[PDB]
């Protein structure tokens, strides 16, 4: 019984977070009222990883909703699975964070962080064996980015020997709320490098391109992007919450995926790519699932893997399929394209299979890549950051909250260090 404590902060973190909980709740046969109405008890074997039992046999998510304004969290509680969340676990202020990392991290957020920690402590102390935390949030805003990383730093101080995992949404000018998103993202990446073990980089640039090019969506909305995020988050947690999965947990993923402490930013992928309300009727063959999940057009990070090399890879197939075929299909990928795998980590590709498929797909596959091509994402953010910072543009929003220019210079330098470090291992 290895419990995970889920935290979702800010608008983006709570929207994907809410989408995540209703999706996996349906996969485990948990209805919006928290009562189980499933058919197979395979859904209940490891249900405790994410759910508490409470009384009456009603499962309650081990989830904490954080935000600096109430708007998004009122929407969650209004939602269909809004009644499933423990009401004491809504922690919010009224001031807001105004898309300002400084407000989330140093001023507004500091006033409310202790209250969140009190809820975290409550959940953790009733865990038979707490394995770690997972946080959903964006990096372009103020609350999930500025306050999110503040929580992560304080959680690590109190639980120094637990795994810290995040689902982090990277900003893109293609889906931009404000011009200061590069400032907020750069400041946050520095925190993630120090204080997370695993981060799934979810790039809104990629989610948009998938919706526009692959899914043929003229004007994609956040709902469409979150549908891709929803399917990914379900894929990369399947092995954590279903039986017969070698007791997979957060720590073993980090041990095998992360050869160097700072290089822990994963590229997620998913196949088949499916639009919301667009359900197709022919299931993919195992060859098809394998090819598409390694295809650049199925990556959620907006980096070309052929521009770098895989340090490690984890994949999970979901459905009733030929495992022997799954084995052959994965082996040929590595044997065919062995140049895109660092030769100094033998057998760096792990394959898992789960018999239970996700809703609306007879089979699917999810990709978790630790690729040096991720440096393309941090280079993109670095160029945007520097273009404004070389003219100190929009900085007064941050100096007015107590920040100094030096702290920007240091976040810029660390991200450039991170980039050159990924390029170091692209030599081999």
């Amino acid at each position: 019984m290895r419990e995970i404590v889920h935290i979702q902060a800010g608008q983006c973190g709570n929207q994907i977070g809410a989408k995540f909980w209703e999706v996996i709740s349906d996969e485990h046969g948990i209805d919006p009222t928290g009562s189980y109405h499933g058919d197979s008890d395979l859904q209940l074997e490891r249900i405790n990883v994410y759910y508490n039992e409470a009384t009456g046999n009603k499962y309650v998510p081990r989830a904490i909703l954080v935000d600096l304004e109430p708007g998004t969290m009122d929407s969650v509680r209004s939602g269909p699975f809004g009644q499933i969340f423990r009401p004491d676990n809504f922690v919010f202020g009224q001031s807001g964070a105004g898309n300002n990392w400084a407000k989330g991290h140093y001023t507004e957020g500091a006033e409310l962080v202790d209250s969140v920690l009190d809820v975290v402590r409550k959940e953790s102390e009733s865990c038979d064996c707490l394995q770690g935390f997972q946080l959903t949030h964006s990096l372009g805003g103020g609350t999930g980015s500025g306050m999110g990383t503040l929580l992560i730093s304080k959680i690590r101080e109190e639980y120094p020997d637990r795994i810290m995992n995040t689902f982090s949404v990277m900003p893109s000018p293609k889906v931009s709320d404000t011009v200061v998103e590069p400032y907020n993202a750069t400041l946050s990446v520095h925190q993630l490098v120090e204080n997370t073990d695993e981060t799934y980089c979810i790039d809104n640039e990629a989610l948009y391109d998938i919706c526009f090019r692959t899914l043929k969506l003229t004007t994609p909305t956040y709902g469409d992007l979150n549908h891709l995020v929803s399917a990914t988050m379900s894929g990369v947690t399947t092995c954590l919450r279903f039986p017969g999965q070698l007791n997979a947990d957060l720590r073993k993923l980090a041990v095998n995926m992360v050869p160097f402490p700072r290089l822990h930013f994963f590229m997620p992928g998913f196949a088949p790519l499916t639009s919301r309300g667009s359900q197709q009727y022919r299931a993919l063959t195992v060859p098809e699932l394998t090819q598409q999940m390694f295809d650049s057009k199925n990556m959620m990070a907006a980096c070309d893997p052929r521009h770098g090399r895989y340090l490690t890879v984890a994949a999970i197939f979901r459905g009733r399929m030929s495992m022997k075929e799954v084995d052959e299909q994965m082996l040929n990928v590595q044997n065919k394209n062995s140049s895109y795998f660092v030769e100094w980590i033998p057998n760096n590709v792990k394959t898992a299979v789960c018999d239970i498929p996700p809703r609306g797909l007879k089979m699917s596959a999810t990709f978790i890549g630790n690729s040096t091509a991720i440096q393309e994402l941090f280079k993109r953010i670095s160029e945007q950051f520097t273009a404004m910072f070389r003219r100190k543009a929009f900085l007064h929003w941050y100096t007015g909250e107590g920040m100094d220019e030096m702290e920007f210079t240091e976040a810029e330098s660390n991200m450039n260090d991170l980039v050159s470090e990924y390029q170091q291992y692209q030599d081999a």
């Binding site: 007791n247 947990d249 095998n256 050869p259 100094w344 980590i345 033998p346």
Partner: protein, 435 residues
């Protein structure tokens, strides 16, 4: 009679332990509830099988075994399995979180907090021993618990039972069914730290067992259950002499005496035959199964014995086998095949025959056969497996990949190079002997 205690560590050691003890009960006629109708001395015993089983006043036959795993999932299925009644609760020891595939976490961080508990449980089984020979330790190389805690337990057993023998049954890591990318790290770390504490170790390469289950059993995607029922046959072949009346390998000391002339070179190569698919309509002869022991495809570790030198050979037969038929096969094998020995060792074969044919799990994958042989031969050829493994270690360690996970558990980086350097000595020891 002199008792033997089996210690099962980690997932591999526990699940292989389940396969073995299930098979022991079938070979000895012991019901899942421990009752043994054949045994006519109730509550007491000086019999051959009492080296592995104790007896309660109620006639229950209890294995002299302890099962240790840092996480409870694997042992809990033993606690609720079809042999739950056999073991008593004190013999099953579990924690709450595993070693995360980290040798350092199994040895240093988590080991220190449970090592004393395990020893006391072990002591409580030794108390019931009027004459303890030593221990049989089952574990994997690649697991964090199998590698890390085992090495620590072997350190303390040498302290608390200095006079006793200790034999290992070790699972060598194979990519086909492996678990962690760092299994070469854990393999070298535990082999270095356990070398001076193990008198004789039988490595089983999952690659070999996997390929045998594919070719001979026609199983497309072998499972741990498939592998373990086959591994348990081999382990049964190797321990039968301790459990049945006989004159070859009657105590653990004989394994070292007959198979290990050089202390550091104590990894006999095991070869088995025949492995026959259950769902099939040919009964191999003595010459045929004896000759099969010299085919690479039947060895527990894949390697080429034609290019090494033998230091000792044992032939353990079970079933319809008479000595004359064995010598007729040996002289016939000695000619056509090149079995080069080392100058300082005689070209000799120690032979053992047990008349009860191999027992196979009812409904399992192996067909019942009239005669089987298990060859134990200490060949320098097994050094190929050390070289394979040491190379994969060299590839990762040259970049220091994943080392931070071990150092974070309190292990110093120097233990890596200290371990690798020991392995480099091991390889040169083999080369001087093999020329």
């Amino acid at each position: 009679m002199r008792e033997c205690i089996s210690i099962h560590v980690g997932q591999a050691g526990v699940q292989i332990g389940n396969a073995c003890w299930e098979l022991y009960c079938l070979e000895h006629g012991i019901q899942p509830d421990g009752q043994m109708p054949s045994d006519k001395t109730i509550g007491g015993g000086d019999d051959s099988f009492n080296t592995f089983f104790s007896e309660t006043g109620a006639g229950k036959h209890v294995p002299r075994a302890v099962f240790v795993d840092l996480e409870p999932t694997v042992i809990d299925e033993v606690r609720t399995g079809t042999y739950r009644q056999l073991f008593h609760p004190e013999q099953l020891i579990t924690g709450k979180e595993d070693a995360a595939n980290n040798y350092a976490r199994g040895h240093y961080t988590i080991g220190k907090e449970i090592i004393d508990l395990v020893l006391d449980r072990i002591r409580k089984l030794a108390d019931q021993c009027t004459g303890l020979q030593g221990f049989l330790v089952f574990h994997s190389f690649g697991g964090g618990t199998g590698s890390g805690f085992t090495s620590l337990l072997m350190e303390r057993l040498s302290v608390d039972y200095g006079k006793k023998s200790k034999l290992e049954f070790s699972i060598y890591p194979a990519p086909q069914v492996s678990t962690a990318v760092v299994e070469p790290y854990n393999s070298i770390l535990t082999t270095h730290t356990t070398l001076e504490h193990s008198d004789c170790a039988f490595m089983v390469d999952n690659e070999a067992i996997y390929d045998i289950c594919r070719r001979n059993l026609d199983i497309e995607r072998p499972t741990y259950t498939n592998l373990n029922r086959l591994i348990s046959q081999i382990v049964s072949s190797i321990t039968a002499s301790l459990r049945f009346d006989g004159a070859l390998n009657v105590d653990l000391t004989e394994f070292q005496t007959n198979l290990v002339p050089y202390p550091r070179i104590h990894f006999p190569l095991a070869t088995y035959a025949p492995v026959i698919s259950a769902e099939k309509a040919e009964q191999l002869s003595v010459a045929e199964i004896t000759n099969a022991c010299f085919e690479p495809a039947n060895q527990m570790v894949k390697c080429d014995p034609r290019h090494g030198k033998y230091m000792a050979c044992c032939l353990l037969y079970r079933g319809d086998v008479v000595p004359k038929d064995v010598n007729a096969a040996i002289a016939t094998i000695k000619t056509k095949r090149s079995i080069q020995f080392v100058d300082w060792c005689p070209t000799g074969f120690k032979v053992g025959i047990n008349y009860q044919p191999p027992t196979v799990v009812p409904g399992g994958d192996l067909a019942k056969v009239q005669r089987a042989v298990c060859m134990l031969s200490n060949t320098t050829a097994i050094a190929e497996a050390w070289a394979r493994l040491d190379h994969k270690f060299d590839l990762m360690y040259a970049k220091r990949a994943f080392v931070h996970w071990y150092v974070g558990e309190g292990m110093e980086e120097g233990e890596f190079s200290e371990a690798r350097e020991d392995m480099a000595a091991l390889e040169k020891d083999y080369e001087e002997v093999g020329v």
